[PDB]
Amino acid sequence: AFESTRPEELTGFVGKHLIYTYDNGWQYEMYVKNERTIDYRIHSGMVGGRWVRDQLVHIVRLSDDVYKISWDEPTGTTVSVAVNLAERRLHGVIFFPQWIAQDPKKTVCFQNDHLDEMRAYRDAGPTYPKLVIDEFATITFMEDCGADDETVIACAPSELPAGYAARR
Amino acid sequence: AFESTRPEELTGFVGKHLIYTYDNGWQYEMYVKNERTIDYRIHSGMVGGRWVRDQLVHIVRLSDDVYKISWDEPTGTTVSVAVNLAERRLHGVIFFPQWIAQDPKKTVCFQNDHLDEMRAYRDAGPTYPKLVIDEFATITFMEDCGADDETVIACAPSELPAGYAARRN
């Protein structure tokens, strides 16, 4: 299932830590913690406040500058993000189950402490139709944190020093 | 909902007609019929024989050479493909509902005439866990057909001329 994960091709991407704003104004943050894991933190928008550690992902190199990260969430949401490092442009597609569209705050938590809850909501549904969000984003801040730094994304967006998400 | 669709960014991509084989051996064919539509045709693998016309998609430029196409299916499957035109490689992530993993032939049809059926199977489930296929592919044949050519994908894969899907460039 992770056959396509090729660490040797990902050395320019693993370790990246990006803050970005989608064209709809939602502000997101992702840390590429290793070849198969991300942490992420949502700052604003429909699910602002939600954050997630140790999400297993599929990370591939598309070109020298472009990388893709795709994953399935315990809520039922599926995601594929691409990043163009050179252009500092991200694109995401997010397929939300209908239950999230109807009541998105249900997912606004530190997910890792609410896994059973998320699975229950997922299982109760409804699932369909999906709310599909497909948007470009500007990468406003990007840094290289190296792999397996557990401090990059370790608290809620409300617990960060002033101006954190507004940098660059 | 199609705000990300930017025709000026897609002029090198619209009209492309690709035949490709995933690293697991499954052979797929896609036609980028316009800025928001594909037709596709599966030749082999878990759902070989399936074909689809007029699938609404989100097509975006990632670079000069790399484009992305993403979409939701009436089966519950969600898809995102990226094509690297220069390297003649494709990458797909496909998130199949569990019901498809268990009985994939249920989806082998001209889907456009079986929308209610696909949605029924989708609604009955199971949905979870998803069977996630994340795989590279080699693009074996690529040509420019221009937009809105209704003849490119207009029959089942069984009805094509003998070596059609094996042609290369």
Residue numbers in the entry:
A (entry chain A): 24 to 191
B (entry chain D): 24 to 192
Provide text from the study.
Enzymatic decarboxylation of biobased hydroxycinnamic acids gives access to phenolic styrenes for adhesive production. To date, several PADs have been biochemically analyzed and structurally characterized. PADs adopt the lipocalin fold, and the core of the protein is formed by two mutually perpendicular β-sheets. In solution, a homodimer is formed by two monomers that are related by an improper 2-fold axis. In this study, we used ancestral sequence reconstruction to generate thermostable decarboxylases.
To gain a better understanding based on their activity and stability, we determined the structures of N31, N55, and N134 via X-ray crystallography. The models for the remaining ancestors were predicted using AlphaFold 2.41 N31, N55, and N134 were crystallized with one, two, and three homodimers in the asymmetric unit at a resolution of 3.1, 1.6, and 2.5 Å, respectively. Also, the overall structures of the PADs were found to be conserved, leading to an RMSD below 1 Å if aligned to BsPAD. The C-terminal part (depicted in red) shows some structural and sequential diversity. N55 and N134 harbor an N-terminal loop (depicted in blue) absent in N31 and BsPAD that contributes to some extent to the dimerization (compare also Figure S4). All ancestors showed a highly conserved active site architecture with identical catalytic machinery. The residues corresponding to N132 and T41 in N55 originate from these helices. Both were found to form a hydrogen bond to the NH1 atom of the catalytically active arginine in all crystal structures.
